[PDB]
């Protein structure tokens, strides 16, 4: 009770070669080998001989490297320290083999080892209905504890969904630091989940972009392809426009671009397409569900929560079992500081890190 700790061991730590790099990880850590070949960050799936579960470690090798670096390593250790739910990715542990300060380079980051991410789950499974509610349902459930933080995905993406053998999701990488991108080979996954807000910075828009996503998604699961597979900024409007229709004088007033109004006038126009025509075979309620997540005004888009109370999630809908995240303090984030001022703050959080319980 009145007991207290008056010091505590380091870890011992070993080390060895991993991606062609010097992986040094705590004794705790086994068998850690290569996942996803680049695609995440440095990620190695490991056996946690603590909690007997297998486990994956992300390396973070260029955290500090300029102040734009240095606050998002903040930013995202801050928010993965937060997020305690059973659809987000959060953490098992946390560490740095740096004694000090004075030594303090690389952070590594362990959470639950899922095996999958959702864009490898459609590549080998055509999905029934069953597993669509389910692997929807578990993505509104995230949202809806993510949202109630006032933090928001802007990303969402089937490479951002984690998914095991079990069908069971969760959410990874938040949108504005979330590994290496812009543009390798094709146009990759990137800007066909996307809201049309944000896509051409229309208002300062809202959480219901992550909803546009999950429309997006959704979509795929039942019919196996693309949705809106644009070519450009521009292919993507016009192929979003083909569906949802063009929006009217009203929708147009409320966004203050110049650039999108006057772009958007010279298209023909459009009328909000049959949705039972294009999502055929599926679950009518899936169906109205999508009609009320696919559509552009902001304002009139489905919320987290509204979402998981549609008759398509009854199955697995229980609102005693949806919890909402602790408020989450960004305070930091109207902070200009120097590189050795986040990394500091950084160092902070590593070492005060405090696991989960086992079990």
Known sequence: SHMLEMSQERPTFYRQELNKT???????????????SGAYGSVCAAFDTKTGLRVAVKKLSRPFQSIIHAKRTYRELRLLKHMKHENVIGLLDVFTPARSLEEFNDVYLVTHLMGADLNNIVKCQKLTDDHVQFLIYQILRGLKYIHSADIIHRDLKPSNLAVNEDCELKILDFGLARHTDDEMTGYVATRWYRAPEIMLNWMHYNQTV??????????????????????????????????????????????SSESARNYIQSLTQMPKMNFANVFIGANPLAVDLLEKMLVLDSDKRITAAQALAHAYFAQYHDPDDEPVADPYDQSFESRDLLIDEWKSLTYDEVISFVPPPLD
């Not at 010097?22 to 996803?36: A, D, K, T």
């Not at 999950?214 to 979003?240: N, S, W």
């Open 22 to 36: 010097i992986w040094e990880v705590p004794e705790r850590y086994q068998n850690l080998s290569p996942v996803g």
């Open 210 to 255: 992550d909803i546009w996503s999950v429309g997006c998604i959704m979509a795929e699961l039942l019919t196996g392809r693309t949705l809106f597979p644009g070519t450009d900024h521009i292919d993507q409007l016009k192929l979003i426009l083909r569906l949802v229709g063009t929006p009217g004088a009203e929708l147009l007033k409320k966004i």
